[PDB]
Amino acid sequence: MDCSTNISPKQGLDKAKYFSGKWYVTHFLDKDPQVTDQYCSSFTPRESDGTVKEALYHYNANKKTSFYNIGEGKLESSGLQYTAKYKTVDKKKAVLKEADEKNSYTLTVLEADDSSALVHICLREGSKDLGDLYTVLTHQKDAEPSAKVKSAVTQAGLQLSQFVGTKDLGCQYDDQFTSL
Numbered sequence: 001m002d003c004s005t006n007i008s009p010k011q012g013l014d015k016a017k018y019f020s021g022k023w024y025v026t027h028f029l030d031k032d033p034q035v036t037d038q039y040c041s042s043f044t045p046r047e048s049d050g051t052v053k054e055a056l057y058h059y060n061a062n063k064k065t066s067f068y069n070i071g072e073g074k075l076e077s078s079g080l081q082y083t084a085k086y087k088t089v090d091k092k093k094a095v096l097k098e099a100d101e102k103n104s105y106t107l108t109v110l111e112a113d114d115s116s117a118l119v120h121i122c123l124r125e126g127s128k129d130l131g132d133l134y135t136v137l138t139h140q141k142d143a144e145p146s147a148k149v150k151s152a153v154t155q156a157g158l159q160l161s162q163f164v165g166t167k168d169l170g171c172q173y174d175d176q177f178t179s180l
């Protein structure tokens with residue numbers, strides 16, 4: 001597998017709209033999943049002098065288990081795009097593994113407004129691309145994405161209908177973990 005190539009951040013986006021609130025994934029598009037388990041995710045991204053830190057949460061909807069990470073990276077010269085190394089933590093944010101130099105993700109923001117966003121994420125380990133994911137995001141669980149963000153899905157060459165909708169998965173979030 002190869003992460004999608006035509007990916008660059010939309011220019012003219014207002015970063016205070018992305019580094020805002022918390023995000024819940026309402027729809028995801030996973031190109032070549034190595035597992036069949038489907039997940040829910042929420043994260044809280046903050047930025048300061050070009051360094052991003054974000055608490056990251058995954059819920060396995062089949063096994064009904066959750067795992068936790070903290071990402072850190074630097075904004076690119078191109079705009080709202082950053083490559084993040086990440087720690088592995090427990091629900092109390094105790095560090096189980098420090099960030100290393102082989103594991104990272106690149107996050108690119110394709111659209112972001114007052115209520116919603118579209119972002120792309122390539123997860124990598126050493127020389128291999130592990131996962132390519134598009135995610136539609138809202139600020140509350142199960143809120144409808146904006147017409148603008150829906151338009152950006154189609155602009156990106158995609159069909160929203162072909163994403164997995166997370167509402168039917170029976171998601172469970174930990175809003176204490178994502179807070180702050």
Ligand code: HEM
Pocket residue numbers: 025028030035038039040041043056058069086088105107121123133135166
């Ligand atoms: C609902 C949306 C998402 C889905 C379906 C999803 C799915 C997955 C899956 C299946 C894995 C591998 C789990 C394993 O077998 O260990 C994973 C790992 C990971 N994801 Fe996501 N993910 C989502 C959202 C996100 C987002 C928004 C971010 C970044 C902000 C992110 C960052 C990561 C990272 C860093 C890992 C590596 C964790 C590790 O190696 O322990 N994910 N995700």
